[PDB]
Amino acid sequence: ATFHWDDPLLLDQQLADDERMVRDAAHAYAQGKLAPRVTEAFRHETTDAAIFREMGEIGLLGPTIPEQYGGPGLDYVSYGLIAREVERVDSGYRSMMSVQSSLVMVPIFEFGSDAQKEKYLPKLATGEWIGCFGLTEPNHGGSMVTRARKVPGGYSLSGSKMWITNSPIADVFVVWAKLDEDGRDEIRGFILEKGCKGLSAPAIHGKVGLRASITGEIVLDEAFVPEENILPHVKGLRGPFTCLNSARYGIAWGALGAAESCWHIARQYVLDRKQPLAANQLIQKKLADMQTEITLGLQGVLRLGRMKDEGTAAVEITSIMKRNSCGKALDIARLARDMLGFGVARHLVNLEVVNTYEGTHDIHALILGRAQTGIQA
Amino acid sequence: AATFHWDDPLLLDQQLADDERMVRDAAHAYAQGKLAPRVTEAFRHETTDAAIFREMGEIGLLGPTIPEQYGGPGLDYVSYGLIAREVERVDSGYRSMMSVQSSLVMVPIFEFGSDAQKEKYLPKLATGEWIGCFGLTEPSMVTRARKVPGGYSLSGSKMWITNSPIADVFVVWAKLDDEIRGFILEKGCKGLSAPAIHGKVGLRASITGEIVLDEAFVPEENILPHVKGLRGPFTCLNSARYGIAWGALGAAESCWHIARQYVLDRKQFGRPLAANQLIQKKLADMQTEITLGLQGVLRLGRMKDEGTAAVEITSIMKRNSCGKALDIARLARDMLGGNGVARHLVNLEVVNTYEHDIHALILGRAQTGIQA
Amino acid sequence: ATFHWDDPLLLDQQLADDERMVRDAAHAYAQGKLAPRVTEAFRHETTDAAIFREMGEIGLLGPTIPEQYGGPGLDYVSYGLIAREVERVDSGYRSMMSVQSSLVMVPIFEFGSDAQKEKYLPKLATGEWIGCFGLTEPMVTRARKVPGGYSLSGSKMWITNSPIADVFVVWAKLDEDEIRGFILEKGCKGLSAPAIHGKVGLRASITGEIVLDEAFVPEENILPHVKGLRGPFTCLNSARYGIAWGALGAAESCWHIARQYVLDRLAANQLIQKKLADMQTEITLGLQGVLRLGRMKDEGTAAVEITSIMKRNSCGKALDIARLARDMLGGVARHLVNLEVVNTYEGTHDIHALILGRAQTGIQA
Amino acid sequence: ATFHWDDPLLLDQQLADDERMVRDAAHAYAQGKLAPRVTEAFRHETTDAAIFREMGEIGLLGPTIPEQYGGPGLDYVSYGLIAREVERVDSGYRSMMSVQSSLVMVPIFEFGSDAQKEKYLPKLATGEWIGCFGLTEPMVTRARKVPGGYSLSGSKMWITNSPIADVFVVWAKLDEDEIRGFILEKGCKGLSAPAIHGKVGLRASITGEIVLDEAFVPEENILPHVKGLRGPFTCLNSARYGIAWGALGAAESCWHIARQYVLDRKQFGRPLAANQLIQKKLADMQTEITLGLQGVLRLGRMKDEGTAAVEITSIMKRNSCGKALDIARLARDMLGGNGISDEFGVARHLVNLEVVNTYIHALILGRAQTGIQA
Ligand SMILES: COC(=O)c1cccs1
Numbered sequence A: 001a002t003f004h005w006d007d008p009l010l011l012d013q014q015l016a017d018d019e020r021m022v023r024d025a026a027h028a029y030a031q032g033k034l035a036p037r038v039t040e041a042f043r044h045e046t047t048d049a050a051i052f053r054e055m056g057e058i059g060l061l062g063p064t065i066p067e068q069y070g071g072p073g074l075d076y077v078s079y080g081l082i083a084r085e086v087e088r089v090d091s092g093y094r095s096m097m098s099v100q101s102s103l104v105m106v107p108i109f110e111f112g113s114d115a116q117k118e119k120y121l122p123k124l125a126t127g128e129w130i131g132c133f134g135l136t137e138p139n140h141g142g143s144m145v146t147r148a149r150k151v152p153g154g155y156s157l158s159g160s161k162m163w164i165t166n167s168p169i170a171d172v173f174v175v176w177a178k179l180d181e182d183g184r185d186e187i188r189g190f191i192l193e194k195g196c197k198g199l200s201a202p203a204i205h206g207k208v209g210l211r212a213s214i215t216g217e218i219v220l221d222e223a224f225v226p227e228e229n230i231l232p233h234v235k236g237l238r239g240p241f242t243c244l245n246s247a248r249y250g251i252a253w254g255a256l257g258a259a260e261s262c263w264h265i266a267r268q269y270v271l272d273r274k275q276p277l278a279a280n281q282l283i284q285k286k287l288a289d290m291q292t293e294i295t296l297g298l299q300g301v302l303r304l305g306r307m308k309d310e311g312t313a314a315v316e317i318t319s320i321m322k323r324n325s326c327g328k329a330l331d332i333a334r335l336a337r338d339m340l341g342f343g344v345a346r347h348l349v350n351l352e353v354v355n356t357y358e359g360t361h362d363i364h365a366l367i368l369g370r371a372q373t374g375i376q377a
Numbered sequence B: 001a002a003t004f005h006w007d008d009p010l011l012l013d014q015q016l017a018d019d020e021r022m023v024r025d026a027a028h029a030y031a032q033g034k035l036a037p038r039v040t041e042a043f044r045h046e047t048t049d050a051a052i053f054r055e056m057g058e059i060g061l062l063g064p065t066i067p068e069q070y071g072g073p074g075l076d077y078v079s080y081g082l083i084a085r086e087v088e089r090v091d092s093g094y095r096s097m098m099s100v101q102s103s104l105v106m107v108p109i110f111e112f113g114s115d116a117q118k119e120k121y122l123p124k125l126a127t128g129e130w131i132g133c134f135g136l137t138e139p140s141m142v143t144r145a146r147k148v149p150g151g152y153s154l155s156g157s158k159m160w161i162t163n164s165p166i167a168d169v170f171v172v173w174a175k176l177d178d179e180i181r182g183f184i185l186e187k188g189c190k191g192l193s194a195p196a197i198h199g200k201v202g203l204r205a206s207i208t209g210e211i212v213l214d215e216a217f218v219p220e221e222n223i224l225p226h227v228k229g230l231r232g233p234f235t236c237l238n239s240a241r242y243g244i245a246w247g248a249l250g251a252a253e254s255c256w257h258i259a260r261q262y263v264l265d266r267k268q269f270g271r272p273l274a275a276n277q278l279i280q281k282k283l284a285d286m287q288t289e290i291t292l293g294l295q296g297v298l299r300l301g302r303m304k305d306e307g308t309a310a311v312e313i314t315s316i317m318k319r320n321s322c323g324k325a326l327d328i329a330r331l332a333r334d335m336l337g338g339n340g341v342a343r344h345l346v347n348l349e350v351v352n353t354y355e356h357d358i359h360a361l362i363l364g365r366a367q368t369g370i371q372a
Numbered sequence C: 001a002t003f004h005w006d007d008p009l010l011l012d013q014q015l016a017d018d019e020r021m022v023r024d025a026a027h028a029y030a031q032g033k034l035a036p037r038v039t040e041a042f043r044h045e046t047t048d049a050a051i052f053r054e055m056g057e058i059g060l061l062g063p064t065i066p067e068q069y070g071g072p073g074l075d076y077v078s079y080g081l082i083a084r085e086v087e088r089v090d091s092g093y094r095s096m097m098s099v100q101s102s103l104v105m106v107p108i109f110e111f112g113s114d115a116q117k118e119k120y121l122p123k124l125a126t127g128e129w130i131g132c133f134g135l136t137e138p139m140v141t142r143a144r145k146v147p148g149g150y151s152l153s154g155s156k157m158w159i160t161n162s163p164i165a166d167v168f169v170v171w172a173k174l175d176e177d178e179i180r181g182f183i184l185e186k187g188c189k190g191l192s193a194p195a196i197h198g199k200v201g202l203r204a205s206i207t208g209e210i211v212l213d214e215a216f217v218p219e220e221n222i223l224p225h226v227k228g229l230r231g232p233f234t235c236l237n238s239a240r241y242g243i244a245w246g247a248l249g250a251a252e253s254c255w256h257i258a259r260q261y262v263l264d265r266l267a268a269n270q271l272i273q274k275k276l277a278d279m280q281t282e283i284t285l286g287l288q289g290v291l292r293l294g295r296m297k298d299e300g301t302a303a304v305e306i307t308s309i310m311k312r313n314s315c316g317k318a319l320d321i322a323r324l325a326r327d328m329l330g331g332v333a334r335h336l337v338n339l340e341v342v343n344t345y346e347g348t349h350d351i352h353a354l355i356l357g358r359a360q361t362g363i364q365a
Numbered sequence D: 001a002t003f004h005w006d007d008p009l010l011l012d013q014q015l016a017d018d019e020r021m022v023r024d025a026a027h028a029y030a031q032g033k034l035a036p037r038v039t040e041a042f043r044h045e046t047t048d049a050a051i052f053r054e055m056g057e058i059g060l061l062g063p064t065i066p067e068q069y070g071g072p073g074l075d076y077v078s079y080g081l082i083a084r085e086v087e088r089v090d091s092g093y094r095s096m097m098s099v100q101s102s103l104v105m106v107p108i109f110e111f112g113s114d115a116q117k118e119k120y121l122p123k124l125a126t127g128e129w130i131g132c133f134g135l136t137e138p139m140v141t142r143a144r145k146v147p148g149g150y151s152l153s154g155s156k157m158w159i160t161n162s163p164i165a166d167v168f169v170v171w172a173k174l175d176e177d178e179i180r181g182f183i184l185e186k187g188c189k190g191l192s193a194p195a196i197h198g199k200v201g202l203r204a205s206i207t208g209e210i211v212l213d214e215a216f217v218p219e220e221n222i223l224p225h226v227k228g229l230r231g232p233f234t235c236l237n238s239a240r241y242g243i244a245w246g247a248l249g250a251a252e253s254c255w256h257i258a259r260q261y262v263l264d265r266k267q268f269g270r271p272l273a274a275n276q277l278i279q280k281k282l283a284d285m286q287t288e289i290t291l292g293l294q295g296v297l298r299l300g301r302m303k304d305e306g307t308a309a310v311e312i313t314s315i316m317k318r319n320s321c322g323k324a325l326d327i328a329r330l331a332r333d334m335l336g337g338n339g340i341s342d343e344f345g346v347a348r349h350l351v352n353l354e355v356v357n358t359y360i361h362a363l364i365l366g367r368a369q370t371g372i373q374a
Helices: A017-043 A050-057 A076-089 A091-111 A114-126 A238-272 A281-310 A315-339 A343-356 A363-373 B018-045 B051-058 B077-088 B092-112 B115-127 B231-265 B277-306 B312-335 B341-353 B358-368 C017-044 C050-057 C076-087 C091-111 C114-126 C230-263 C270-299 C305-326 C332-344 C351-361 D017-044 D051-056 D076-089 D091-111 D114-126 D230-264 D276-304 D310-334 D342-358 D361-370
Strands: A131-134 A147-151 A154-165 A172-180 A185-193 A215-226 B132-135 B144-148 B151-162 B169-176 B179-186 B208-219 C131-134 C150-160 C167-174 C178-185 C207-217 D131-134 D142-146 D149-160 D167-174 D179-185 D207-218
Touching: A017 A050, A017 A076, A017 A091, A017 A343, A050 A091, A050 A114, A076 A091, A076 A238, A076 A281, A091 A114, A091 A131, A091 A154, A091 A172, A091 A185, A091 A238, A091 A343, A131 A154, A154 A172, A154 A185, A172 A215, A172 A238, A185 A215, A185 A238, A238 A281, A238 A315, A238 A343, A238 B358, A281 A315, A281 B277, A281 B312, A281 B358, A281 C270, A315 A343, A315 A363, A315 B277, A315 D342, A343 D310, A343 D342, A363 B231, A363 B277, B018 B051, B018 B077, B018 B092, B018 B341, B051 B092, B051 B115, B077 B092, B077 B231, B077 B277, B092 B115, B092 B132, B092 B151, B092 B169, B092 B179, B092 B231, B092 B341, B132 B151, B151 B169, B169 B208, B169 B231, B179 B208, B179 B231, B231 B277, B231 B312, B231 B341, B277 B312, B277 D276, B312 B341, B312 B358, B312 C332, B341 C332, C017 C050, C017 C076, C017 C091, C017 C332, C050 C091, C050 C114, C076 C091, C076 C230, C076 C270, C091 C114, C091 C131, C091 C150, C091 C167, C091 C178, C091 C230, C091 C332, C131 C150, C150 C167, C150 C178, C167 C207, C167 C230, C178 C207, C178 C230, C230 C270, C230 C305, C230 C332, C230 D361, C270 C305, C270 D276, C270 D310, C270 D361, C305 C332, C305 C351, C305 D276, C351 D230, C351 D276, D017 D051, D017 D076, D017 D091, D017 D342, D051 D091, D051 D114, D076 D091, D076 D230, D076 D276, D091 D114, D091 D131, D091 D149, D091 D167, D091 D179, D091 D230, D091 D342, D131 D149, D149 D167, D149 D179, D167 D207, D167 D230, D179 D207, D179 D230, D230 D276, D230 D310, D230 D342, D276 D310, D310 D342, D310 D361
Parallel strands: A131 A172, A147 A172, B132 B169, B144 B169, C131 C167, D131 D167, D142 D167
Antiparallel strands: A147 A154, A154 A215, A172 A185, B144 B151, B151 B208, B169 B179, C150 C207, C167 C178, D142 D149, D149 D207, D167 D179
16 A cells, blocks of 8 residues: 555545546636636736636536536535635635535525525526625624615615625625514525615725635615515524535635645745755654644545535534634644745635634634533633 | 534544444443543552453453454454543553553564464463563664574563563564564563563553563574564554554543533633633634544544555554644643643653654655655 | 853843852752752652751741841842742742742731741741741631630631641731731641642642631731732732742753753754754743843832733743653653643633733723 | 833833934834835835935944944944834835845945945945845856956845845855855946845835846955855844844734724623733733843843854844744734724734744754754
8 A cells, every 4th residue: 555645544535436526627627717817816806707607617606506406416525625626726716606605505595485596596506697695794793783674565775794705796695684573683684686776885905815806895775675585484593504504614625725735835845945955854844734634624524524415414513624624724824834935825814814704703612612511601 | 403412523433333333332341440440549559450451351352453263353443443542541551551462462473473373372462361562672773683503592671661571472573694573482481581660650550661681592483484674563563553543532532521521610700611712712622633633543444444554644643643632631731720631641741752753754754755 | 252052141141249159059959958859759749848947047038038037138039049949959849938938928027017027037037937828718718806816717728838837827808808917826726737648740849728717816916017909919929920930940950851861862853953942042031031020129110010921921931841841751740740730820711811911901801 | 110011121221321212213213204104115015215315314224333434333232223113114124224234234344345344334324325135046156257356147036125226245156275245336237136026025125136147346346354154144143133123023013003903892792802812812922022122132232242152143033033923923813804904014014024034043053052963
């Protein structure tokens, strides 16, 4: 038996040929089309919507969505493998894809009416329509202030969502808002379309990380939403969480792609650098640590993927892998950065935003601590 | 929605074959039933109890991978892993005693020995009737064999040998003419002395000593015929390191469990300690590392059973398990206020320091071609 | 232009001639009398009160206490140099000392009466009387006015020196509820001090409890010039200052042991070198901090929050260095279990981070 | 009696009255003139040559250079305090200063002829002439003897100031019976200095190449009093001392920004400052800066009194930069959002410090402890 330094536990052999082909298709697309764009896309914060069509056309948008609705009807491991190949190039591109698949197609497929599913899903699956997802607000992460008023014909929406990836270029908007409906105040999901009166999506520029992805606001001022546009089959925490859980899973796989790019570059760098550097034992220890955390992270997300597919995965498990992948990836980017004398620095600032996106209070540690102790911090 | 198991998030239990689950439960019932009530006083007073070898041999826990042909239970590598984890869950010293019999003594005889050696030594080693030790370390190896009528004559010293003062069987590595060879010696071989060493800081539950050799006659039927060079010792060490990778995770789990129960019990400014945000971070870290470390040694086990595992993978897992376990023992120790965990901690400081950072450098060479 | 690996910033050169001999005095004592004792003392948790006699003999007890009361009349830099030389051998030893100096002789000197100071200090200085400090409980311990005198009742826990102490400085509450200081003496009825055995760290020091079952305390035994929080706190702040110097001595043993180890077989290893450099750096920087704190304490320019910086840093870094040294080996182990206790003695909630966080922000955690 | 959270060991009071004045002048300048420039200068990688004359006119260039040659004749502590007030704004600005001081003025003063020192130093001191330091390559750069002097052929990479420099201190190998230092001037035939743009860190400083193609150097342009390693090393040792102070200015900025952030920000009803972990991090930042400052101070004094070995600058540079980078990362990870607010001045300090920490010392201390090279 021979050693594969780049795949010590032979993940490649733990996958079905099925999943390998999906991985290889995602790799071919990301390396062929995204890598030639990424440097100046990031450097100059370009808007590049053409990516939704490209991924849609080869069946990599909404991977778990059934063929009935235009999806490629794949499993969670394949979704994972796709995220990882996209983020290997850049987290901003993976972000764009996460939104479409997990934050837009999922809640529509899961909670929407037949009419909503057939109207929206097929066009989201091809990338003809671009989605975004409105949950997070100007600042307090349930405690949401965006509000729907029952009016003749449907609903009137007022509030503001902030840091919404895809929002300046989106055709479809999934927005979460409190509806006080006699005499109970619950969170409901609403579909809005581009050009809806009272709906704005201003762009945010001068971002520090995720510069390759166009991000903006969702500003709602008495924006009318017809009855047929409320998500009928969900209320409360279940709506937003189903989406977030799907997205966190993809990010857990994706951040390991980013970690792997940093690791490969660091390794190649020390192989090429005469001073060679590879003979240094502090350098060797760093490479051993990178290889280790990635190899173990990959076994975790693979096992989680398999459990999700078999229906045995509790939601708390996602907190372990997302938190671990993002944290370990950031550690690896910092370690690789500190070893260099372009790509790494990009992944590094991307990962700094990703690690802090869901707050600076370590939400996943708290989900896990509560799961262990019973007690909320 | 599916149920979360905080103590087994990836449902390791469900990834085990039923065979493997039963081996685990058998080791668990033994270690919790026989070793746990002994451990506190044994560690405090460095009391030897070799009764463990006979006890473990009875339930077929020694030489787990050795075929039934030779008295062994004929289990797979995953089962070996599970046993070490259940034993180290109590104490690393008890696990060391077992690592030695299984990986350092029965493995070399089975892998490199003659039919005669295997039929003679393995069955009593498997039942724990004979106790084995592994003579490699020395106080670029000094110990030498020399050819004489009927056999060989050995002279030299081995130091820090676990099991040696109580061993019946000795697997000794000496240079012959210039290659390292393995020799099987018995207690009551003229020329062999095995004095004890006392007052260790860690692994106090096990007994360790020397092997002093002086014209010790080893008959012809007693040289290991099927190995020469670094392959002999390294094969044993590779086997032992695999069991230690699982074992350090059992010790890590105990520390995690103790720390979790501790913060559930103790109170701080009105709330239980478990309510603190910092405490939960630590519990989350302990849970994460244990859960991921387990998936690693399980995959390594599966690969060894299918013959797809290279030797470098063992380095990843042993270094990771021992390093993470040590981090968790320290985290747990630092979470306690006053003056089990302290014992696990000093044990894991010896385990981690034993072989420096040879594994990071093995992994470094495997990535880069260059040896440092 | 000549480099000292063991003293990169030449602390020696920053010390007064007076201070430099006191350090070498505590060093000659610690290495001469304490080093040959420590291994077996720690091993069996043996009691040896001879150390109080010996340190007293040579003026290392209550070192800031004025010559008028039996003290050597030294300053804070000198006090720290002593703690550091003593802890360099063992933390348990330093603990016994810093109880005498900071937790017994300081509160008596600072808050005592003329008669109390004349009676207790001179004998505490020579080590003839051994003191202990009674603050920590399993605060509930109350003073009840009599007759006398006062009638104290309660229990103190983890009291170093107590099973062999002659003098007990006990802090209890009294209403007119304010915390007051009390002096008690061995033989006192209702007072008892049973030992505590089977410790993990600090085995070389003796520790016990203070059980007060309506112990009678004459009015000539209460501390007049102290009430409330600033009592215990003045003592603790004094001890914390000494521990900040001490932890660094223990850190230095571990570094020196570790450096010697890699020389005797390893020193070419770049991982090792990084580790030895980290030890060198943190100790070197730690010393500049405690020295500067000392100079400031002697000039009156030192605020109390500064003791939180240096104590937290010394202890935390010493523990890191002891663990770094241990993981390099194949004395350190004893310093390690000691430092593990020392880092958590004041709790596990990082009291000094919270003190400093508040000083920076004006907001309590 | 009173705690000073921003200066717990009152470093202020450990300074001579002379050193304090110099610090206040560096502060007033950097805050007055550099703070308003930085955000846009860093964003667009803007070139402002004018800063050298500004720094020159207040005697911030070549602080240790004697008054005889236009220097302000200050001590090492003062040089340190200057670098710290400048890097408090931005490492890119400090990088310009330390190149002029330690990498251009120092080799000429230390190793140059008397005619070189009086030709070059007074103009370098006023900022009339801008200098650069040609050591790093993509050593191969070669000086060869020709009638009248030397011909230089070679190529230097990542040379800060090079595209705007009037004076080039170029280290090249010359064969005599070894590394030699040469002085070149702007406009020399066979000398070009193309700029590098698109940098990740240190964007506020201009950096470029030195390309030498048979560049003729007069005989009186070779540095007469240095051969081999000690030349480039002495400059770098000087620069390293300045970097050790500057890095702590940067760290102090990230610390201050993080502290104000948690003051202005609320989370779950309470201000962020009330969070235990936040307080720990702020205690760590305060601790490492305070101790870092005591270290660089003591090093300066030793350098002034002439008792510091080269090894001590290694420990101080490594520590300052390594701790400054930890503090920047600690501050960064405390901030929510993505670039728009003031607090993301921390992101700027961070990419700067990632380059500074990269621009060996642990192996110096290891070998100095042990006598064994690794
Ligand atoms: C893709 O952007 C998001 O909404 C995220 C959700 C969780 C991490 S990032």
